[PDB]
Design a protein around this ligand. Structure first.
Ligand code: CHL
Ligand code: CHL
Ligand code: CHL
Ligand code: CHL
Ligand code: CHL
Ligand code: CHL
Ligand code: CHL
Ligand code: CHL
Ligand code: CHL
Ligand code: LUT
Lengths: 207, 163, 222, 192
């Protein structure tokens, strides 16, 4: 059995049932089965939004560095709110909150009762396939035939990339707070002289 | 009541001056640094601090130059005299209820023993210390016993003389 | 039971099944069951009031420390609000007295008779708002519009509410005492403690340890 | 239909006209309360038809709805359409009371239950009614068309509370500036 720490004890409630189950729960956070289900859904949601965020931060960073983008990509991701758009900052938040309210209320209704929100509200002939997991929908969310050919393997790749993206986004957030630099600048400074430009030394120079 | 604040009373200042003058008159017969000189200087300092503290407390002084306490809870609250009688009233009532409840609890606990009279003159000191510490929360338990009807013995269970 | 407040002590038996219970009652205030029910309701009401108050103090203070907004501090927020208030002081007090008399009498009547405020004729047609959950201190109805008391994690949320409530009560009393002792705001006190925690604490504010009661303070100093 | 797909509707709301199972707070659980609330909903909805049709229809005829009772306090005379109109504000409330309270007193004197909600008879000209097949269909049409009408009228009051202007011209500002002029941009609906 694969695990985060070989030769160590595994919690009894982690038996490989979950995708990406490596027995890593030193704090025993998910103990009751309902809390574990909520944490599985939260891990999937946070990981997918972190994958999108990592892609969106890395795409702007090379566009601003190489100049392939515009003046919008020249601004850092933490200074992108100071850029001027066609709409002010107040209205964009409201429309995205409304669209997210609709989408996430549909998702939460699936989470409470599986298969409850599986039909198009305005088209009675368009329905999602039955046997849908709360975190793994079907139909129009998988327009390509990708859920044949080791569904179990593709869930493991999803959760692995999700965890890596969550760590990368947290690294973006922390490196912006401490160094005040874009991620590619931090990567170049580490690739300049790594033995003095890392978390040690820089934070010792910060002090 | 026609009184004046002690911080602006001429009799109060005259009394402070006279007391300091009497203590200084006693002070001049001793050499500096001796024990009577140090004791009299400490008394003088205590006198000055006491008169300053009584002036700063908002106490009202009569024509005699002496502080007069205000005990009506209305006049004390609307004129800043609640520290003279009202807050001491609350403090005393809390401590007195503490003592009475501790005594009642000890008596009731000793009533259930095989020799109830033995605990009244040979004190169960650990039990008395435990009950005494539990007397801090006396108003809650006492008010609950009053509402429950367990605070009072029934009149049919209390002896009376023929009428 | 969530645990033991004093490991090794004999916890009282009447606190075994309460939510948020650590067996803590050294004064035996909750030994009577009616007292225990009344104090459960009282702890919940105090907890929720302190919860909302500590939120309304700390979240504006944290946002001001981050520079997001500029709101008046909590000990002076009454002054700047009353000057811009369309409703003056006395009628605000009277309205608060009326509204709280009404809602607290309704809460009290539900405590005395559970579910009584949800019966027919209890309100003027709107008694379905307050049918009750049959539990002391957990009303439901309009007070639970999202309906998460029917969820599986209801017992965990009860424990979360009570512990955050005790933390919030201690936090508000800390805010009040820290203002009364230091004269500054709570985030200012936190930053002063983080700058020099040995020298910036309650032992040096000049209030919490009076000089007359502690003569060694002026003696054992450089 | 269903107000929230997948949610379990209450059992006592089944078979009602205009029913979507929307009662999360259980207000109509008691049948005596439920019966009165249908009359309350229908009367609120029917009065919302008159309010919206009026507010919108008058200004489609070039007559704001907020500016309509603005000749009594500041000074002037009542005017309907273009005809010079008699009576005064003090006399208008006298005819207001006798007409409406006289009509509303007859609204609840009947011992029937369906007649308090759906009168019929002298209140249904141009036929209609008949047996069942279209009466229930416009029973559903009445509650749903009435439901936007009271939402719009509250929206009429709330918009003028935030902007101080009319609803028809504020519609024009929503087409002129769809992203820079809405309820989020003004510093009234959402502060800070
Ligand atoms: C939780 C209640 C509460 C507390 C702790 C404070 C505390 C404070 N207020 Mg404040 N206020 C409070 C409630 C209210 N205030 C105000 C209106 C103002 C103004 C306009 C100002 C303050 C200011 C102040 C500060 C000055 C010190 C003071 O006035 O002590 C007051 C201490 C109290 C404890 C007040 C009494 C509150 C009371 C206990 C609430 C409950 C009473 C009920 C009748 C409950 C009775 C029992 C029930 C079961 C029947 C201080 C931080 C001012 C200050 O900054 O200038 C120097 C300032 O200008 N307050 C209103 C509007 C009606 C309140 C509503 O409840
Ligand atoms: C879908 C991702 C995406 C988003 C959200 C934006 C965002 C924006 N860009 Mg790109 N861009 C994006 C993909 C790409 N852009 C560009 C190349 C440019 C240029 C050269 C410019 C933009 C500009 C703009 C703005 C046009 C309005 C808008 C804020 C313009 C700008 O920054 O402000 C007007 C601008 O001049 N984009 C390339 C390279 C082919 C992309 C891939
Ligand atoms: C022995 C009982 C007793 C007596 C004889 C008085 C006497 C007095 N009180 Mg006091 N008080 C007493 C107990 C208590 N009082 C008060 C709380 C007050 C207040 C709040 C006020 C008085 C006031 C007064 C004065 C006018 C009262 C009146 O009837 O005006 C007709 C008068 C000197 C008033 C004042 O202070 O002086 C004019 C006033 O405002 N009393 C409480 C707390 C509930 C008491 C217990
Ligand atoms: C358990 C202690 C205790 C309690 C709860 C009471 C309670 C009462 N006493 Mg009794 N007493 C008590 C001890 C004693 N009393 C008395 C002699 C009297 C008299 C002569 C009268 C009362 C009266 C009263 C009543 C009015 C309050 C009062 O007048 O206090 C006054 C109390 C005293 C003058 C004595 C108090 C002494 C001490 C402070 C209390 C004893 C403390 C215990 C030794 C503590 C031990 C606890 C430890 C072991 C845990 C009230 C029922 C009066 C009355 O009947 O009202 C209707 C009354 O006329 N007590 C003596 C002998 C000196 C005691 C010992
Ligand atoms: C007024 C607020 C308040 C009330 C009514 C209660 C009431 C209750 N507590 Mg809670 N608590 C309260 C605040 C806090 N509690 C706690 C921590 C706990 C624990 C760990 C436990 C309880 C438990 C209980 C229950 C049984 C014990 C009892 O009978 O207490 C009755 C209490 C009163 C009648 C109030 C008495 C207040 C008294 C006048 C205080 C005066 C001295 C204080 C030390 C001053 C405070 C200074 C502090 C802020 C520095 C009952 C529901 C036990 C239970 O089993 O769980 C539900 C339990 O295990 N409480 C903290 C964190 C320190 C608080 C703040
Ligand atoms: C215990 C709760 C509580 C109390 C007594 C206060 C007290 C105060 N706040 Mg604060 N706040 C409170 C909780 C919270 N607040 C805030 C965020 C703010 C902001 C951003 C501001 C204040 C301001 C003020 C002051 C001006 C009065 C006011 O807000 O207009 C009265 C407003 C209304 C009458 C409309 C709002 C009605 C409300 C939505 C009803 C909610 C009822 C619910 C059933 C909840 C009931 C609460 C429970 C605990 C009983 C006043 C001193 C202002 C300031 O600091 O000084 C000028 C200000 O700008 N508060 C948050 C969010 C973190 C809270 C939680
Ligand atoms: C919610 C709990 C709480 C927290 C996190 C703080 C935080 C702080 N307080 Mg405050 N306080 C808190 C509650 C209370 N405080 C005070 C009274 C004061 C005063 C008078 C002062 C502080 C000061 C401080 C600073 C620490 C130095 C100190 O003197 O310790 C406070 C010492 C105490 C004995 C109070 C501790 C009470 C606390 C409930 C103990 C329990 C703590 C928990 C076991 C663990 C808490 C962990 C955190 C993460 C929740 C720090 C910013 C000082 C400051 O303002 O400038 C540096 C200062 O002068 N506190 C009272 C009334 C007794 C409280 C109840
Ligand atoms: C002093 C002003 C006062 C007005 C009408 C009140 C009253 C009302 N109008 Mg009348 N209006 C007023 C001036 C004017 N109105 C109108 C033109 C109309 C029209 C066309 C309509 C009303 C409608 C309505 C009513 C909608 C609810 C109802 O009872 O329907 C019952 C409402 C009572 C509506 C109505 O009566 O529904 C049939 C309606 O359709 N108003 C003009 C332009 C000619 C006015 C100036
Ligand atoms: C969208 C508009 C609308 C619709 C679809 C209905 C639908 C219905 N209504 Mg309501 N009404 C409508 C607007 C209004 N109604 C009313 C007040 C009434 C009354 C007083 C009555 C109806 C009746 C009817 C029924 C047959 C008559 C009819 O109007 O059919 C389209 C049918 C269920 C009648 C009934 O309920 O059954 C015969 C009846 O007596 N409606 C007013 C106030 C003037 C309105 C504006
Ligand atoms: C159902 C239930 C269920 C659960 O359980 C709970 C809850 C959620 C709470 C609930 C829901 C709800 C709703 C939201 C309510 C609201 C409403 C409406 C809005 C009313 C109206 C109401 C509205 C209507 C009446 C109306 C009115 C109208 C009027 C006529 C007006 C008039 C006007 C016009 C003509 C114009 C002129 O020139 C002037 C005037 C005169 C001014």
């Amino acid at each position: 059995r694969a695990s985060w720490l070989p030769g160590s004890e595994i919690p009894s409630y982690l038996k490989g049932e979950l995708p990406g189950d490596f027995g890593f729960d030193p704090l025993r956070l998910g103990e009751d089965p309902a809390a574990l289900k909520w944490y599985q859904q939260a891990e999937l949601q946070n990981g997918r939004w972190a994958m999108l965020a990592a892609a969106g931060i890395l795409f702007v960073d090379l566009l601003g560095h190489l100049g392939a983008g515009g003046p919008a990509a020249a601004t850092p991701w933490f200074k992108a709110s100071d850029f001027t758009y066609f709409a002010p900052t107040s209205t964009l938040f409201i429309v995205e909150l409304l669209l997210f309210a609709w989408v996430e209320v549909r998702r939460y209704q699936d989470m409470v009762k599986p298969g409850s929100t599986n039909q198009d509200p305005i088209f009675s002939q368009y329905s999602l396939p039955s046997g849908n997991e709360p975190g793994y929908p079907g139909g129009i969310f998988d327009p390509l035939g990708y859920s044949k050919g080791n569904m179990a393997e593709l869930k493991l790749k999803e959760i692995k990339n999700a965890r890596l993206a969550m760590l990368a986004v947290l690294g973006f957030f922390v490196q912006a707070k401490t160094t005040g630099k874009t991620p590619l600048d931090s990567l170049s400074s580490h690739l300049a002289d790594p033995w003095s430009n890392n978390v040690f030394g820089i934070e010792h120079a910060r002090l | 009541s026609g009184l004046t604040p002690c911080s602006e009373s001429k009799g109060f200042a005259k009394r402070q001056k006279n007391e300091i003058k009497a203590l200084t008159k006693r002070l001049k017969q001793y050499e500096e640094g001796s024990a009577p000189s140090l004791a009299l200087k400490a008394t003088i300092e205590r006198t000055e601090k006491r008169f300053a503290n009584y002036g700063n407390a908002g106490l009202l002084c009569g024509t005699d130059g002496l502080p007069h306490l205000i005990s009506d809870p209305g006049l004390a609250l609307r004129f800043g005299h609640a520290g003279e009688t009202l807050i001491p009233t609350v403090g005393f009532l809390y401590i007195a209820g503490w003592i009475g409840t501790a005594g009642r609890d000890y008596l009731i606990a000793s009533k259930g023993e095989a020799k109830p009279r033995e605990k009244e003159y040979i004190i169960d000191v650990p039990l008395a210390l435990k009950i005494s510490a539990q007397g801090a929360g006396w108003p809650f338990r006492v008010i609950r016993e009053l509402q429950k009807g367990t605070l009072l013995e029934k009149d049919s269970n209390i002896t009376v003389s023929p009428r | 039971k969530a645990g033991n407040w004093l490991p090794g002590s004999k916890t009282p038996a009447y606190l075994e099944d309460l939510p948020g219970s650590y067996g803590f009652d050294p004064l035996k205030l909750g030994e009577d069951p009616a007292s225990l029910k009344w104090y459960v309701q009282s702890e919940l009401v105090h907890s929720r009031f302190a919860m909302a108050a500590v939120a309304g103090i700390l979240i504006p203070e944290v946002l001001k420390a981050f520079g997001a907004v500029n709101l008046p501090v909590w000990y002076e927020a009454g002054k700047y609000a009353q000057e811009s208030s369309p409703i003056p002081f006395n009628t605000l007090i009277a309205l608060e007295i009326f509204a709280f008399n009404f809602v607290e009498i309704k809460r009290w009547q539900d405590f005395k008779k559970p579910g009584s405020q949800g019966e027919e004729g209890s309100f003027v047609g709107l008694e379905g708002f307050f049918k009750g959950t049959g539990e002391n201190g957990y009303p439901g109805g309009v007070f639970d519009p999202l309906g998460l008391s029917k969820g599986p994690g209801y017992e965990a949320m009860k424990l979360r509410e009570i512990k955050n409530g005790r933390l919030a009560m201690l936090a508000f009393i800390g805010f009040a005492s820290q203002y009364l002792a230091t004269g500054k705001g709570p985030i200012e006190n936190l930053l002063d403690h983080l700058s020099n925690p040995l020298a910036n604490n309650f032992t040096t504010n000049g209030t919490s340890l009076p000089a007359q009661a502690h003569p060694l303070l002026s003696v054992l100093k450089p | 239909g269903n107000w929230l797909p997948g949610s379990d509707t209450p059992a006592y709301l089944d078979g009602l006209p205009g029913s979507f199972g929307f009662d999360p707070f259980g207000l109509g659980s008691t049948p005596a309360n439920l019966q009165r609330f249908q009359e309350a909903e229908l009367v609120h909805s029917r009065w919302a038809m008159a309010g919206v049709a009026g507010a919108l229809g008058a200004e489609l005829l070039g007559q704001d709805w907020y500016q309509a009772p603005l000749w009594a306090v500041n000074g002037g005379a009542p005017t309907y359409l273009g005809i010079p109109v008699p009576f005064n504000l003090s006399t208008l409330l006298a005819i207001e009371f006798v007409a409406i309270a006289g009509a509303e007193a007859q609204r609840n004197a009947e011992p029937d239950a369906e007649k308090r909600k759906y009168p019929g008879g002298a209140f249904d000209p141009l036929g209609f009614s008949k047996d069942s097949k279209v009466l229930e269909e416009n029973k559903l049409k009445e509650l749903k068309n009435g439901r936007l009408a009271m939402l719009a009228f509250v929206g009429f009051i709330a918009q003028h509370a935030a902007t101080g202007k009319g609803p028809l011209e504020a519609l024009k500002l929503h087409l002129a500036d769809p992203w820079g002029a809405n309820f989020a941009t003004n510093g009234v609906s959402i502060p800070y």
